[PDB]
């Protein structure tokens, strides 16, 4: 569960979870047959003994296309007891008034759209970043190659390609 209000900043939001503290609960945001845990700074837990305000997530447009499947971590096996996706974090009402992060979902040439004008594709070969879009110091994405951007005015409905 998460509070009624959420912010898109460096501090991000935080959710609360009810689960036995015996587990470890890494992210494992899958994209294919592979799982690609790939969330060092996107999710972060304090202390599993208490509610610990799990999942200090830093939201961005890519989540709209990304299902997470919170999994369990053991020594021999991973995600064997509990493994379910963040179903309602799959889709969030993104406030177009406030800026947000512009990580990319996949390498397959995703095109950015502000309000239907079909802004230049994000993963287009030989890409030039717009002057307005700022790159974050630490890209918050499953792939280390993908950088992070900021998009204050609108910039929703990232079109596939």
Partner 1 sequence: TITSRRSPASARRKARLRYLPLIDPRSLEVQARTILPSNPVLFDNINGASPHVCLTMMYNFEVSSAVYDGDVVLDLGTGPEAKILELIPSTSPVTCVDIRPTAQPNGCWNVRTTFLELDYLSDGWITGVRGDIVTCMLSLGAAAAGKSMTFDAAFQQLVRVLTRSTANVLLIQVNCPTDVIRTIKGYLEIDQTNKRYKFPKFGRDEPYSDMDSLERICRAAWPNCSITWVPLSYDLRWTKLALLESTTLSSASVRIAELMYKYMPIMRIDIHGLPMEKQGNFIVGQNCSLVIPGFNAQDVFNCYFNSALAFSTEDVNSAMIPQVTAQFDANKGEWSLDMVFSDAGIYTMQALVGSNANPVSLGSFVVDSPDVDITD
Partner 2 sequence: IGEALSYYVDYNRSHRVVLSSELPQLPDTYFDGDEQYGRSLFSLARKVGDRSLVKDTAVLKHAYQAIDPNTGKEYLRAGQSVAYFGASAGHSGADQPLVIEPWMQGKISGVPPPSSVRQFGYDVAKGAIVDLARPFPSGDYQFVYSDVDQVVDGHDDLSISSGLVESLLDSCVHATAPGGSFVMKINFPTRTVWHYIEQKILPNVTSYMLIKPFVTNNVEVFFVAFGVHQQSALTWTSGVYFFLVDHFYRYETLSAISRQLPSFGYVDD
Residues forming contacts to partner 2 in the complex (CB under 8 A) are 21-24, 26, 28, 34-37, 73-78
Rounded distance, CA 107 to CA 122, Å? 9
**Binds 143: which of partner 2, partner 1, none (CB < 5-8 Å by kind):** partner 1
Question: Within positions 121 to 160, which residues make up the interface with partner 1, using CB under 8 A?
Answer: 143-145
Is residue 161 near partner 1 by the rule CB under 8 A?
Answer: no
139, 148 contact by CB (below 8 A): yes
Taking CA atoms, 109 is separated from 40, 84, 125, in Å, by 24, 29, 8
Q: How far apart are the first and last CA of the chain?
A: 33
Is residue 37 near partner 1 by the rule CB under 8 A?
Answer: no
**Binds 19: which of partner 1, partner 2, none (CB < 5-8 Å by kind):** none
Q: Where are the beta strands (DSSP E) in the chain?
A: 70-73, 78-84
Is residue 109 near partner 1 by the rule CB under 8 A?
Answer: no
**Binds 49: which of partner 2, partner 1, none (CB < 5-8 Å by kind):** none
């Amino acid at each position: 569960a998460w509070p009624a209000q959420l912010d898109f900043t460096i501090a991000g939001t935080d959710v609360d979870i009810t689960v036995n503290p015996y587990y470890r609960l890494m992210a494992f945001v899958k994209i294919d047959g592979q799982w690609q845990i790939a969330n060092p700074d996107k999710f972060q837990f304090f202390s599993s003994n208490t509610g610990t305000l799990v999942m200090n997530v830093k939201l961005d447009i890519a989540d709209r296309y990304l299902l997470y499947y919170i999994r369990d971590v053991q020594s021999r096996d991973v995600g064997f007891y509990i493994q379910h996706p963040l179903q309602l974090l799959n889709t969030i009402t993104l406030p177009t008034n406030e800026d947000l992060f512009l990580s990319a979902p996949d390498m397959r040439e995703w095109a950015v759209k502000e309000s239907g004008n079909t802004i230049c594709i994000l993963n287009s070969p030989g890409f030039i970043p717009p002057q307005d879009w700022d790159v974050l110091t630490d890209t918050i994405s499953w792939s280390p190659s993908l950088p992070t951007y900021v998009v204050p005015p609108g910039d929703y409905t990232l079109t596939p390609l």
